[PDB]
C-alpha cells in the first residue's frame, strides 16, 4: 500500500575476536531515516534523513537505549542458535530481523510483520493474522513454543497496529516535501555498435523515486524477455533511484525496438524509440 | 519508533 | 547456512561530463554472508575517502551495500571497483562505463 515503516537488524558473530557485529537501520518507504552500526564511534542511534534531526533528545536517547536492547537480544540469540544447530565455536553466523507495519492511502493499519533468519535462511516469522508463527525447522519450533508461553504475539500486536503506524503516520507529516513525493524516472536511449552487425539499445530511467519500476523491450510491438539484460534498481546516493535495460538489435533495426516504461509517477507508461 | 521487546530465541 | 555471490555495479551518481564534479557509485547487492571487502580504485590505485551507507538486505534475505567517493570524471582517468567475497576465488574489478 502507499506507505511502510521497516526496521532491519542483522547481527554477524565473530568467535576470535569479540562481541557480534550489530547494524539496526530503520525505513519510512524507500527513505533511511535512522541508523546503529557497533563498529562506529557515537554508540548512538544516528539520522540519516532531514525531517528527523527535528526530533528532540528524548527520541534519541530511548532509540539508543532499546536498539542497545536489541544487540543484546541478538548477541544471546547467536549462543542459543550455535547451540539448537550443534555448531561449532569456529565459525561466523548470521541473524537477520526485519518488523514493521504497511498503512494504505487513508493511512490505517494495512498489515504487521516479523521476520527472522538465520544464515540467510526463514527461521521463524509471524503470520499475517498477527497470531500466530510460522516455523522453518524444528529448531524453530523450540523458539515457538518459547514464544507461545512468554505470549510474545500479543505484545508485538500491540506495537505493529499501534505505535509503528502512529509514528509512521508521524514521519509522514513531519516530511510531507520528501515522503509523500513522487519522481518520474527521466528517460532518455542511447546506442553502442557491438559486432560489425549488431547495436546495443541502452533504455533508462533516472532520478526517479519510489523503487518500484518496469522496463520492457517490445520488437515490432511483441514483447522480449528473450535476448535482453536487465540491471537490478540502485540508489543514485541523492536518495533517487536509476535503471536500465538493454536488448541487442541487428544493425539496420533499432527503429522496430521500442522499451516501454512504469512507474506510479507516470499515468500512461511511457513508449522511447531510438531516435538521434 | 522501535520495539520496546528483546525475543531471545 | 547460505552463499549468494553479489551482483555488482559501478556507475556515476549524475551523468558523467568530463571536468564536472560527480559521485562515483559501487553497489554491491544479493549476497550473503555479509563480510565483504570493497573499494573503489583510480587508475588501478585505492581512493581512500570512501562512504558506504548502512547494511540492509532484501526480500530474499540477500544483503546490500553502496560504496560512494565524490569524484570528477575525465577522458583517460580509469575509475573501476575490487570486491572480495568469500564465494569468490579472486576479487572481482568491475570497470565503469559512464553508459552503464
Given at each position: 500500500?502507499?506507505?511502510?515503516?521497516?526496521?532491519?537488524?542483522?547481527?554477524?558473530?565473530r568467535?576470535?575476536?569479540?562481541?557480534?557485529?550489530?547494524?539496526?537501520?530503520?525505513?519510512?518507504?524507500?527513505?533511511?531515516?535512522?541508523?546503529?552500526?557497533?563498529?562506529?564511534?557515537?554508540?548512538?542511534?544516528?539520522?540519516?534523513?532531514?525531517?528527523?534531526?527535528?526530533?528532540?533528545?528524548?527520541?534519541?536517547?530511548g532509540?539508543?537505549?532499546?536498539?542497545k536492547?536489541?544487540?543484546?537480544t541478538?548477541?544471546?540469540?547467536?549462543?542459543?542458535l550455535?547451540?539448537?544447530?550443534?555448531?561449532?565455536?569456529?565459525?561466523?553466523?548470521?541473524?537477520?530481523?526485519?518488523?514493521?507495519?504497511?498503512?494504505?492511502?487513508?493511512?490505517?493499519?494495512?498489515?504487521?510483520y516479523h521476520?527472522?533468519?538465520?544464515?540467510?535462511?526463514?527461521?521463524?516469522?509471524?503470520?499475517?493474522?498477527?497470531?500466530?508463527?510460522t516455523?522453518?525447522?524444528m529448531?524453530?519450533?523450540?523458539?515457538?513454543?518459547?514464544?507461545?508461553?512468554?505470549?510474545?504475539?500479543?505484545?508485538?500486536?500491540?506495537?505493529?497496529?499501534?505505535?509503528?503506524?502512529?509514528?509512521?503516520?508521524?514521519?509522514?507529516?513531519?516530511?510531507?516535501?520528501?515522503?509523500?513525493?513522487?519522481?518520474?524516472?527521466?528517460?532518455?536511449?542511447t546506442?553502442?555498435?557491438?559486432?560489425?552487425?549488431?547495436?546495443?539499445?541502452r533504455?533508462?530511467?533516472?532520478?526517479?523515486?519510489?523503487?518500484?519500476?518496469?522496463?520492457?523491450?517490445?520488437?515490432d510491438?511483441?514483447?522480449?524477455?528473450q535476448?535482453?539484460?536487465?540491471?537490478?534498481?540502485?540508489?543514485?546516493?541523492?536518495?533517487?533511484?536509476?535503471?536500465?535495460?538493454?536488448?541487442?538489435?541487428?544493425?539496420?533495426?533499432?527503429?522496430?525496438?521500442?522499451?516501454?516504461?512504469?512507474?506510479?509517477?507516470?499515468?500512461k507508461?511511457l513508449?522511447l524509440?531510438?531516435?538521434? | 519508533?522501535?520495539?520496546?521487546?528483546?525475543?531471545?530465541? | 547456512?547460505?552463499?549468494?555471490?553479489?551482483?555488482?555495479?559501478?556507475?556515476?551518481?549524475?551523468?558523467?561530463?568530463?571536468?564536472?564534479?560527480?559521485?562515483?557509485?559501487?553497489?554491491?547487492?544479493?549476497?550473503?554472508?555479509?563480510?565483504?571487502?570493497?573499494?573503489?580504485?583510480?587508475?588501478?590505485?585505492?581512493?581512500?575517502?570512501?562512504?558506504?551507507?548502512?547494511?540492509?538486505?532484501?526480500?530474499?534475505?540477500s544483503?546490500?551495500?553502496?560504496?560512494?567517493?565524490?569524484?570528477?570524471?575525465?577522458?583517460?582517468?580509469?575509475?573501476?571497483?575490487?570486491?572480495?567475497?568469500?564465494?569468490?576465488?579472486?576479487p572481482?574489478?568491475?570497470?565503469?562505463?559512464?553508459?552503464?
Amino acid at each position: 500500500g502507499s506507505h511502510s515503516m521497516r526496521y532491519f537488524f542483522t547481527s554477524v558473530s565473530r568467535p576470535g575476536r569479540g562481541e557480534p557485529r550489530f547494524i539496526a537501520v530503520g525505513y519510512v518507504d524507500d527513505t533511511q531515516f535512522v541508523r546503529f552500526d557497533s563498529d562506529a564511534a557515537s554508540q548512538r542511534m544516528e539520522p540519516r534523513a532531514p525531517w528527523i534531526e527535528q526530533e528532540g533528545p528524548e527520541y534519541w536517547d530511548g532509540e539508543t537505549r532499546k536498539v542497545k536492547a536489541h544487540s543484546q537480544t541478538h548477541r544471546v540469540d547467536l549462543g542459543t542458535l550455535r547451540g539448537y544447530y550443534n555448531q561449532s565455536e569456529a565459525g561466523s553466523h548470521t541473524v537477520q530481523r526485519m518488523y514493521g507495519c504497511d498503512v494504505g492511502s487513508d493511512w490505517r493499519f494495512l498489515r504487521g510483520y516479523h521476520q527472522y533468519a538465520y544464515d540467510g535462511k526463514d527461521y521463524i516469522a509471524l503470520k499475517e493474522d498477527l497470531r500466530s508463527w510460522t516455523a522453518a525447522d524444528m529448531a524453530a519450533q523450540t523458539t515457538k513454543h518459547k514464544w507461545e508461553a512468554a505470549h510474545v504475539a500479543e505484545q508485538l500486536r500491540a506495537y505493529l497496529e499501534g505505535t509503528c503506524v502512529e509514528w509512521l503516520r508521524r514521519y509522514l507529516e513531519n516530511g510531507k516535501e520528501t515522503l509523500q513525493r513522487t519522481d518520474a524516472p527521466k528517460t532518455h536511449m542511447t546506442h553502442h555498435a557491438v559486432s560489425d552487425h549488431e547495436a546495443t539499445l541502452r533504455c533508462w530511467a533516472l532520478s526517479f523515486y519510489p523503487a518500484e519500476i518496469t522496463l520492457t523491450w517490445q520488437r515490432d510491438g511483441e514483447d522480449q524477455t528473450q535476448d535482453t539484460e536487465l540491471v537490478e534498481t540502485r540508489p543514485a546516493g541523492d536518495g533517487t533511484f536509476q535503471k536500465w535495460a538493454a536488448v541487442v538489435v541487428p544493425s539496420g533495426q533499432e527503429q522496430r525496438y521500442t522499451c516501454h516504461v512504469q512507474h506510479e509517477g507516470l499515468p500512461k507508461p511511457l513508449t522511447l524509440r531510438w531516435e538521434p | 519508533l522501535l520495539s520496546x521487546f528483546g525475543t531471545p530465541t | 547456512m547460505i552463499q549468494r555471490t553479489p551482483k555488482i555495479q559501478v556507475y556515476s551518481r549524475h551523468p558523467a561530463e568530463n571536468g564536472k564534479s560527480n559521485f562515483l557509485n559501487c553497489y554491491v547487492s544479493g549476497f550473503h554472508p555479509s563480510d565483504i571487502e570493497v573499494d573503489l580504485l583510480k587508475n588501478g590505485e585505492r581512493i581512500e575517502k570512501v562512504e558506504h551507507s548502512d547494511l540492509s538486505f532484501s526480500k530474499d534475505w540477500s544483503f546490500y551495500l553502496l560504496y560512494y567517493t565524490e569524484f570528477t570524471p575525465t577522458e583517460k582517468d580509469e575509475y573501476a571497483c575490487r570486491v572480495n567475497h568469500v564465494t569468490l576465488s579472486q576479487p572481482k574489478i568491475v570497470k565503469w562505463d559512464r553508459d552503464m
